[PDB]
Ligand binder design. Structure first.
Ligand code: 9PY
Ligand code: 9PY
Lengths: 248, 247
């Protein structure tokens, strides 16, 4: 199990790491959230770039990145444009997605980038190599906000992410039943004990899936998503459960 | 259905917290019952198998009286766990039935524990005796070595319902991480497709801890906490159950 050490956070060891997601529609609103999030205790800051309106301007995007980086200079910073297709806030062409992600990478302002598995294999390969050339780590991601694929399909996707050079494969799926939550946990475990040689993040969405945000140390998810301000768990509550589990 | 003891409704809301009282003699039992008044929990289990002076029914019942004296309004479950199923000692079947009939008669306890594998005829006879005296049965099966198939566990929990258990209960020892999922799988199947009453399930040890926490999710109506591995301090346990319940 290779691990990813960012700043001094070690992902894939110990208790799962708590990610919070910062959403801002403009520079002022990113800055407001950056100030408010800075009071809070968590492990990784995800900047959800798809909420930012001025995405046509790479310079504006990089100004927003710099504000966040400067607000929390020591926090692992993850740059994420989530496509509408996978539950994001707006549409983007594959060429512009690549422009932003490459600009984030070569800016030096971010520690990790999110890259969607189903962007296209040539574009994903290329972008993984560029990130690695610039010492940025890749969280490769797939989300299904409608339903849960079979255990075997989910494992196939995570394994393809490893094959593509992902530092941290990630998958998030929507339960339609409690059975679906067991399927996601079963997929996580198979990955952990038969395939994973790097950290993997998995989650079952919504109220039904909350247990998957708590059970990561047990079945093999290396990070979880927490809220500063269904399924969303406040970071101090989240950390409480993770410690209690860890020390049992 | 649910099961109500002293206003505690088992089978609704958050999983109920059981704490076990474990004293080897009357001194220690009296001292523990007093200290246990300071903790917050839903159900008090008296683990009768820890008690050394076990041959004397009168001695056992006196220990029950001390407990009831310290905590008059707590739901009280009288449990002799045979060594076979993880307990501290073994008694004759006859004395096991004698001790349980004595607890039932005494009016001092609200529930008894009967082990499913005690024998079908003896089990039904005791279940009927309990209900005749308005005492509920937690029917139990524990495997401290391994985890049976989810199919086998569901079959056991259904067989407990068939013999009249008010609350079927299985606790099993995980050997693999998969074993923990298997227990959760059996739990969900029971609750959603078979259970017409509350059911308690647990995966033991550290590996199984999530099963102590996730009862609301997968269908276990109660869990075990400690006042003093895989054990969780009652206050910590309560904290986690509330975070899950209120999400
Ligand atoms: C899983 C979480 C994310 O993907 C974040 O980017 C998002 O802001 C919140 C989230 O969807 C969640 O906590 O359910
Ligand atoms: C399942 C639990 C019990 O049955 C209690 O009698 C015992 O004290 C503790 C227990 O074995 C547990 O919490 O694992």
């Amino acid at each position: 199990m290779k691990t990813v050490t960012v700043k001094n956070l070690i992902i894939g060891e110990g208790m799962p790491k708590i990610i919070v997601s910062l959403m801002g529609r403009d520079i002022n609103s990113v800055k407001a959230e950056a100030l408010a999030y800075r009071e809070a205790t968590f492990d990784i800051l995800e900047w959800r770039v798809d909420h930012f309106m001025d995405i046509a301007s790479t310079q504006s995007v990089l100004t927003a990145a710099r504000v966040i980086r400067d607000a929390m200079p020591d926090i692992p910073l993850l740059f994420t444009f989530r496509s509408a297709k996978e539950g994001g806030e707006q549409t983007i062409t594959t060429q512009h997605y690549l422009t932003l992600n490459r600009a984030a990478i070569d800016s030096g302002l971010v520690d990790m980038i999110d890259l969607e598995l189903f962007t296209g294999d040539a574009d994903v390969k290329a972008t993984v190599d560029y990130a690695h050339a610039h010492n940025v780590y890749v969280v490769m991601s797939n989300h299904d906000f409608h339903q849960t694929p079979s255990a075997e399909e989910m494992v196939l996707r995570l394994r393809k992410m490893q094959a593509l050079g992902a530092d941290i494969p990630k998958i998030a799926v929507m339960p339609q039943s409690k059975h679906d939550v067991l399927t996601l946990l079963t997929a996580t475990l198979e990955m952990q004990q038969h395939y994973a040689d790097r950290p993997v993040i998995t989650m079952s969405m919504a109220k039904e899936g909350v247990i998957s945000r708590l059970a990561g140390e047990v079945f093999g998810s290396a990070a979880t998503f927490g809220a500063v301000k269904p399924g969303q768990i406040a970071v101090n509550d989240l950390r409480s459960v993770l410690m209690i589990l860890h020390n049992a």
